Amino acid sequence: GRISSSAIVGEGSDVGGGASILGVLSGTSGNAISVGKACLLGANSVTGIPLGDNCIVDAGIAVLEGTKFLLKDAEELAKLNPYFNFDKEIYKGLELKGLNGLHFRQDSISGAMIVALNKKAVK
Amino acid sequence: GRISSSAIVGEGSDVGGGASILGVLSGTSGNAISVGKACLLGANSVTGIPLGDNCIVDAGIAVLEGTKFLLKDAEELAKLNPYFNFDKEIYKGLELKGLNGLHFRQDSISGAMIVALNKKAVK
Ligand SMILES: [Cl-]
Ligand SMILES: [Cl-]
Ligand SMILES: [Cl-]
């Protein structure tokens, strides 16, 4: 897939067929996008935020700065991300930037965008 | 409708046919339920939390301590409820207790439970 200027992809990551990684976050002090180690970006996905290590974006999913996600697995994600405040239920893409062990997926019954634990990231 | 022991209903309120108002909130320091002035509780609704003034519970809706609601009209609700923090998008019934101008309804297309502005409460 496509790595825009300023975007950095970490060791062991897999950028799937036709995936997009955008380069620079929106705004005036909009910073560069980095994807961490061992991230898996699905075919035809779009990654518009920085991701930490061991994150998964399912095929077809667009993870943009303003996309809202329903958080699942808060207790396990807290362990991988001890400074982050997992107090609420809905987060914008931009709020989740740089976190480790995230799994972005769509609930195929309800249609909701979810941010959950990458089960492999605990181990 | 049905007013349980410890429940108080304020002036000008209308308790619709078969509505339930519960009396005491759950737990050990579980406090009594009060509905404020000019509240409208729909037929066959259930009110399980304290409500402030000018609140509306649509017919058929159950507003329980643990029910989650999607907040709409945050800026206008902030005006009626200046100390409350409308920072997030999803609130449990119990978190919303005692607030003024709330309108509890169901989104009939998405099926989501909503807490919104009672349009009459601004005026
Ligand atoms: Cl393509
Ligand atoms: Cl009845
Ligand atoms: Cl929320």
Curated annotation (Swiss-Prot), chains A, B:
The gene is dapD. It comes from the Bacteria. This is 2,3,4,5-tetrahydropyridine-2,6-dicarboxylate N-succinyltransferase. Homotrimer. Succinyl-CoA binds at residues 2, 17, 20, 43, 58-59, 66, 92, 105-108. The lineage of its organism: Bacteria, Pseudomonadati, Campylobacterota, Epsilonproteobacteria, Campylobacterales. The chain holds residues 258 to 380 of 386 of the full protein. Coiled coil: none annotated. Catalyzes the conversion of the cyclic tetrahydrodipicolinate (THDP) into the acyclic N-succinyl-L-2-amino-6-oxopimelate using succinyl-CoA. It comes from Campylobacter jejuni subsp. jejuni serotype O:2 (strain ATCC 700819 / NCTC 11168). It is found in: Cytoplasm. Belongs to the type 2 tetrahydrodipicolinate N-succinyltransferase family.
